[PDB]
């Protein structure tokens, strides 16, 4: 079986620029083709016999390589090609997939819009508290929430998930929720949830005094 | 039109065995070999069957579980996996060969392999407040919490309201069930005349529910 390593892993470029993205196979192939994937959907054809642009590509794409070597190329880079990219061989059994190569936007650095919500009233009726935090529409991804419950840091009661970048603005958002039984939540005043992104020069607390609508 | 419209979500015990649909619509089935395609979590090419002849090929690696069929009479191709581990929970596509390469892919088959019963989402409202408002506009979402397996899927006003809303990809917790969230922004002087449902669908459990979401002083 003919791996594909593709390389980088990861990349960002933004408007107009150009990229290049890098697909080895580990023995001689005769085209290797491309597929893009973005989040939600499943992939589509790209390019096959390692230059020909499928139906709806724009032309700035386009590929090159012969041997074990290829390459994709965008000229100019625009919004829509942020995706997943997995190059692909039909040239021996069994066919086989790249490992991909994720292409984001790169943008300039925004700060999170950052909003906390506390246990519904229904919620609190059967016994449980999820407290939500949420950091909307911010730039880069990497980012950091502690949870503090008067002032205690909080450790193993939270969990977090991340959104892939906007279509509009090319932001993430993300959110947090720690959940705690009603018996342990009624124990407490302060609920805050401290953000920590370059986007900000010092860390965000945002909090709520239990009980206040 | 053309569209591979691939059976829903499985949720199949360990060791016993789950078969998966792929019905070719709006073009002529026979004219087109189908693949699969396994998407563990990166795509990994499970094999072909002619949807003419029937003959198959498959990935080493899948022989002993993989298993293809076709029945021509409803256009629909299957495949069988068997002998369920873990390492078989993964997104399944079927993809329709063309001319130059995969053309046309169904939306693909989520299958969640585990003993464990079906498990229908609670949702909780994210009510909008000033804890939630920034610049005249306001956050709101709904919480899906402790539902088996994925997906779930989330719309706000039967689909009316799309511009604004992030819906999160679930979290695995503790106690082994999935919770997300879906939230919208929208104009603070939209509170108070124009409501906001939220509606999910958990497909594993039956599960249908709507839920408005009401602001607060």
Known sequence: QIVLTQSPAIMSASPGEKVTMTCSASSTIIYIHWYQQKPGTSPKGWIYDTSKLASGVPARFSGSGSGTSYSLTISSMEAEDAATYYCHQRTSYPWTFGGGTKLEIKRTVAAPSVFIFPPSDEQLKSGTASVVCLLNNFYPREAKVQWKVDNALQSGNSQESVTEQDSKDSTYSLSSTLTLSKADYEKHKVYACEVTHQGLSSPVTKSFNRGEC | ????????????????????????????????????????????????????????????????????????????????????????????????????????????????????????????????????????????????????????????????????????????????????????????????????????????????????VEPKA
């Open chain 2, 1 to 212: 039109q053309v569209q591979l419209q691939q059976s829903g979500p499985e949720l199949v015990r360990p060791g016993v065995s789950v078969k998966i649909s792929c019905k070719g619509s709006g073009y002529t089935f026979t004219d087109y070999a189908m693949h699969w395609v396994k998407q563990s979590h990166g795509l990994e090419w499970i094999g072909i069957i002619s949807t003419y002849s029937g003959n198959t090929k498959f990935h080493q690696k899948f022989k002993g579980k993989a298993t293809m069929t076709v029945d021509k009479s409803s256009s629909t191709a299957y495949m069988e996996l068997a002998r369920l581990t873990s390492e078989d929970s993964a997104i399944y596509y079927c993809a329709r060969q063309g001319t130059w390469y995969f053309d046309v892919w169904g939306a693909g088959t989520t299958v969640t392999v585990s003993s464990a019963s079906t498990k229908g989402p609670s949702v909780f409202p994210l009510a909008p407040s000033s804890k939630s408002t920034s610049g005249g506009t306001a956050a709101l979402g709904c919480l899906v919490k402790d539902y088996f397996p994925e997906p779930v899927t989330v719309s706000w006003n039967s689909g009316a309201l799309t511009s604004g809303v992030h819906t999160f990809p679930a979290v695995l917790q503790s106690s082994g069930l999935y919770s997300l969230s879906s939230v919208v922004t929208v104009p603070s002087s939209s509170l108070g005349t124009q409501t906001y449902i939220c509606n999910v669908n958990h497909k594993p459990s039956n599960t249908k529910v709507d839920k408005r």
